[PDB]
Amino acid sequence: GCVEVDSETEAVYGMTFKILCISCKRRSETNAETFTEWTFRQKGTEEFVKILRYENEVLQLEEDERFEGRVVWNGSRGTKDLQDLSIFITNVTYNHSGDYECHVYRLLFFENYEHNTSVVKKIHIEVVDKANRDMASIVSEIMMYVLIVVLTIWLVAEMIYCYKKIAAATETA
Amino acid sequence: SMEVTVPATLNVLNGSDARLPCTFNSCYTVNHKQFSLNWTYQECNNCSEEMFLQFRMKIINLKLERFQDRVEFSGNPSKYDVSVMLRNVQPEDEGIYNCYIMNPPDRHRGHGKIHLQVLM
Amino acid sequence: PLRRISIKILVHSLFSMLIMCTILTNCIFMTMNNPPDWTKNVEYTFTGIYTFESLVKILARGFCVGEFTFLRDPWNWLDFVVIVFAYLTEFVNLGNVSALRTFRVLRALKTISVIPGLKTIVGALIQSVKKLSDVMILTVFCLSVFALIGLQLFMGNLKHKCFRNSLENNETLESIMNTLESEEDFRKYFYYLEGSKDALLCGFSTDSGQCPEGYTCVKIGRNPDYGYTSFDTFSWAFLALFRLMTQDYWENLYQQTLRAAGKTYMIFFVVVIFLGSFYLINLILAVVAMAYKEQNQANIEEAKCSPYWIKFKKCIYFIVMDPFVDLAITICIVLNTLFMAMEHHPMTEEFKNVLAIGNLVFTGIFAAEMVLKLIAMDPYEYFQVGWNIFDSLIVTLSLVELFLLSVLRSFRLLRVFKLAKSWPTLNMLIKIIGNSVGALGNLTLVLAIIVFIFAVVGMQLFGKSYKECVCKINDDCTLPRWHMNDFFHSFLIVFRVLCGEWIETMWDCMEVAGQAMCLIVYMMVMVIGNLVVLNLFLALLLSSFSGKIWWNIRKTCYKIVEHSWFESFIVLMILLSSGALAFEDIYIERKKTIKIILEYADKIFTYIFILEMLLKWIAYGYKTYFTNAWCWLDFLIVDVSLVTLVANTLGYSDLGPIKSLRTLRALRPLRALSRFEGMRVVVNALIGAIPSIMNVLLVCLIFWLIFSIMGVNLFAGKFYECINTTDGSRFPASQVPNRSECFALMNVSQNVRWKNLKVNFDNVGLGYLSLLQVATFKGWTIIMYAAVDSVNVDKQPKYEYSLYMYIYFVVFIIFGSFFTLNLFIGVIIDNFNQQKKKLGGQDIFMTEEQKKYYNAMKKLGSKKPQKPIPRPGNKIQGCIFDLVTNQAFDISIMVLICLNMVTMMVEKEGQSQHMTEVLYWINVVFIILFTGECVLKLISLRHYYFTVGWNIFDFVVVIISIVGMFLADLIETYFVSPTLFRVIRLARIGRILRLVKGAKGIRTLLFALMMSLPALFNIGLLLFLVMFIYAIFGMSNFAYVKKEDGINDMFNFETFGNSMICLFQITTSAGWDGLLAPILNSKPPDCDPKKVHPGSSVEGDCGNPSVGIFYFVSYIIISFLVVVNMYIAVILENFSVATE
């Protein structure tokens, strides 16, 4: 079922990027209605200007130029109880860099209890010119090779020592 | 079926107090809103019934003119008890006394019938 | 003179028969349940016959001598009781007629006296019970210790409920509780999981949980199950544990506590089920079986025109043609059954007719041979043979079908047995059935008599209550499916209890009939009823049973493979390789870093294994390498991994296979089997028995097929019903009687669905699955309700229309499960016996090293006397030694421990402070006295004290006990964390364990358990590996299935920890039916094929019906096979210890 996964923090310039904000209800069985707000403050500047609001099925987008155009909803569709809210940007630009805060509003319907809750997920992304390979990927690949080389060296090493001994035994008798 | 225990005939001296004792028994635990008890009197076998006391949330004594203020409730229903007391019995009190008990959730309605006879 | 006449009357052929005939008739009358008024006179006559029968015996035997002859026999005491009782009732009697009347059932017991040889069987049964005295003591003690551990660890836990956070009008949790008492009222306030009887159980820890947001967890109110399921009091805890031991609906207790308690406590259940249930039950079987052999064997040892007909008639006899004509017919019979196997709910009109045409030909051929058969040997000669008469009845039935209960028609399939004569194993099954009504007929008859008495007794005692109460038990105000109101129904409940299904029904009886009465009756049926069933099973089973530089290189590689570091290094890789498997699952997306290393890590593993395999080829060569079973397994695994790696590097991946192939990885732990010596030994034993198992399976399959075919004809296509989708409640049938009517409702109504069961009798293959559930008793009841309810193929089912179809299930259970299981168990244990004989009479469940150790444990059995010790010279030292040495002093300590044990029992939930303080203080005195005893033994004994093993255990217990009290105290001062504290107190239970030292009988049994630990460990290791492979297959395959029944948050296949919890639960095959059900549904509207699943790539939550069925079924069978092993290992050791 639903799992919470943190969004990627580096977006290549001039390429599409997807921001992931996923919020999971404590109990899957319960049914509630959700809506979301994403506010972004550009790097080097204080505060957040709400950029988009998604309620019902239609997505409302603020008129600011930084994000004018370039945004599409990648969230749960037709559910009306979103669970997963994600924003996808086409044609990523430097202007799209900084801190992103996404707040979720959920109406939970219980037997005689109606509960309104707020959870805040904030995503911070920095634009870079060229995709940078993750350090974990690089360390592991280099690390894996060393093991492959060391083991083989060890295996070959025994044979030179073991084999010579075996050859020696035949001659003695 | 509600279990009802009453004396079929109750003989009481004129001027004494007559406790009309009936036992109602059914499964479950009695509920105040749920438990309802009704008592009616008849001068004779074929005679019209006159309700004189009810339990609906609490005891309601209808204060029928024929009894003056001589009727009292005399039972703790939670105990399956719904007895009534007729103080200072008079000859005109002779007749048939009916106890009807309907107890939710029990669908069945209990009925006890006492023939009260007044001595001399 | 009169005495002679009476005496003459007393011993007569007819009189015994006359007394007996009336009694059987009397039994039919008890079954009335509201007999007419006219029947009362008949009641008087029965009273008359007994007095007359009773009077003569007393008149002749007594000689007016005090009835010395008459009352000397024990059975006669029973008759006197019955006569007075019938008579006493007319006389002034006690208030409860039903309680008093129940005695009349005693007359049924008289039947035991009248039938010849029955008296002997009952006596035989009582003798067996005597042997069970030691096991009973241990069982009570064992249940008692667990009850104490359970109570301390889980008391008050079942209470948790989710209480909502915001309350209007300044209400308080305390204020709310007293004022309201209604399910509707309660629901508004606490969570309640969509129609469950009670509130959802919540938990404090991260592992357990969880309550929806806006609801908080607090503990208040009654425990679930009417308050019956709770760990609050010792008595209640004892009932909960007893249920676990007999494994009745044990899965729910397990699921419920884990949820409130948290998953970490799953450990408690593993130890209890593994030691408490599998082991304790086995001990009972061994003792009953062992006891039966001595008595059975001991008793056995003491004994030791006209002329034309003849011409034509002679020709017919030549026509018997045993070499070919007789043989030819059997091929025909096998073919016929196969023909019958083809049926389905939906059958085309042309196909339906073809089946009819085909049947007639077969019916005709069987009759012609019979008519033809008659001419050749003559009628008298013809009916001489039993099979012939058997064949004749079937043929006659078919002829009648054409013109003159069509079900009987379905009956010709039995004919299939005829093959029994040719088959060695089938002959055995035929033999087993015969023994029950043959030599063992008297014993089997007793079972029938006992079931009858209980059904009637239950009916008399609780029949009235169920009707009046109904509501306490049912929301609707109508009788539940299982009730004690009628004899057939009362009988069904008793039969259910024979299978271990007692708890579900008992809660119902208790609500209506009260705790004291319901508990006593059910407990007796279970203990007494089961003992008879156990005796029949065991009795039946036992009786039935009896340059050339290349050469140097080749030599060297051989050196490398043989070397220990390499063998050792390879094993480490296997464990490590297997472990990486556990990490993958739904949560892998999170923790992206671990995912990257694991992906890379596998490549190094693939290279190492491929490298290792090459060394194997050079060292062994191809011929040696491929003639080994293990290597093929090993060679095959590397290949699957190798193909994925080559395909993966290349790209061109994810196109089904190879992608399906990736799922095959779960097989990686499989190479581990060869490496471990312990695991391999167990596997060798199973391979030895597969051929033997195969033979029994064939008989089971053929036998089950007849039941399955029979079932298909009766219920095929009749399980459909129109149900309200919101609550899944079938419509009344007053409206929407047929399928056609149901559809009209849908057109004008949104949520009404016409739907099938999912496990049913639509086709022969499905019938096999339905039968499997009934055989195991899991998921069986849903099916039975469907069968009885059913009316016709396209018609809505009426409630309990068939009612007598229950009989079909009862017959299958007796034949399908009781007999085959008898056969399955008999062959497997025997095969194991042959294996033991072959390998020099040595246990086949232990590695060679284990064998040396097993012998050392055997040495502990010896009683050679240890040195007495010398009193120290000092008198002061000596008197203490003198006092300590005395046996009387030791008995006092034993009494003291028992006193200590009773103190623990008094503890209960919400006891109060004054109560709590006294218990704490009494406990301190106990610690001081016990510590005091230890010091005293030490002063006198000195170095000698340390010599005894028991003294050391006693000394260790004291150290643990003082520390436990102090640490709890330090913890209280330090504070923070209640949970560490409860576990700390568990130390006191240590003193109770010392009781074992005192009882000689219990110790022998305990010693036996210790002896089998080495064998049990190997099986446990093998079992764990199989469970592990399955968990991995499950994680990939079943995560994402829609959550329905048995699958919910927790107890789901989403992660490895979760998968393990489920697999352990199903090992006992409990709830296996529930888990399988979500997997079965495929396609709308059962499920959505493409579902978003936020945070993951995968789409849809549809179980694979084919893959799911193979997986659950295979697991049930495999686990069962290994469990047969535990049964075998325990029995062997038990016979040896008892034998010594």
Ligand SMILES: *[C@@H]1O[C@H](CO)[C@@H](O[C@@H]2O[C@H](CO)[C@@H](O)[C@H](O)[C@H]2NC(C)=O)[C@H](O)[C@H]1NC(C)=O
């Ligand atoms: C199927 O069952 C549902 C669930 O009870 C029924 O829905 C109820 O209908 C009545 C009257 O239409 C409403 O007052 C209740 O509120 C409904 N329950 C809820 C909670 O929705 C429904 O009537 C049934 N379907 C049909 C066609 O009868």
Ligand SMILES: *[C@@H]1O[C@H](CO)[C@@H](O[C@@H]2O[C@H](CO)[C@@H](O)[C@H](O)[C@H]2NC(C)=O)[C@H](O)[C@H]1NC(C)=O
């Ligand atoms: C299936 O059930 C329906 C419903 O009763 C039967 O069709 C008719 O039902 C209507 C009510 O709408 C009655 O007026 C008719 O009398 C019913 N049929 C007849 C001939 O009386 C129908 O017969 C049932 N059987 C089917 C359709 O196979």
Ligand SMILES: NC(=O)OC[C@@H]1N=C(N)N2CCC(O)(O)[C@@]23N=C(N)N[C@@H]13
């Ligand atoms: N309904 C059914 O199959 O009846 C048998 C019994 N009763 C239940 N309510 N169960 C819950 C699930 C289950 O497996 O069906 C079962 N769990 C066990 N141990 N036996 C089953």
Ligand SMILES: *[C@@H]1O[C@H](CO)[C@@H](O)[C@H](O)[C@H]1NC(C)=O
């Ligand atoms: C990028 O930012 C600059 C200044 O912050 C602004 O003038 C420009 O319009 C932005 N780009 C777009 C496409 O709006």
Ligand SMILES: *[C@@H]1O[C@H](CO)[C@@H](O)[C@H](O)[C@H]1NC(C)=O
């Ligand atoms: C996210 O938006 C892109 C824009 O085209 C769309 O193609 C993609 O399918 C969306 N995500 C999903 C639900 O696959």
Ligand SMILES: *[C@@H]1O[C@H](CO)[C@@H](O)[C@H](O)[C@H]1NC(C)=O
């Ligand atoms: C990105 O924006 C530029 C304008 O600066 C536009 O020409 C280009 O088409 C955009 N990229 C894509 C993939 O459309």
Ligand SMILES: *[C@@H]1O[C@H](CO)[C@@H](O)[C@H](O)[C@H]1NC(C)=O
């Ligand atoms: C709760 O619901 C109300 C609707 O009455 C809405 O105005 C409010 O914003 C919600 N609360 C939150 C925290 O969004």
Ligand SMILES: *[C@@H]1O[C@H](CO)[C@@H](O)[C@H](O)[C@H]1NC(C)=O
């Ligand atoms: C009140 O008494 C009458 C007798 O006339 C009876 O019919 C009725 O059921 C009683 N009311 C209730 C609520 O039981």
Ligand SMILES: *[C@@H]1O[C@H](CO)[C@@H](O)[C@H](O)[C@H]1NC(C)=O
């Ligand atoms: C608590 O209950 C009292 C009733 O005595 C009420 O007057 C008061 O308003 C309640 N408190 C709150 C915070 O509502």
Ligand SMILES: *[C@@H]1O[C@H](CO)[C@@H](O)[C@H](O)[C@H]1NC(C)=O
């Ligand atoms: C609903 O019944 C109406 C009759 O008014 C019919 O026209 C319609 O086709 C039916 N619905 C379906 C899905 O067949």
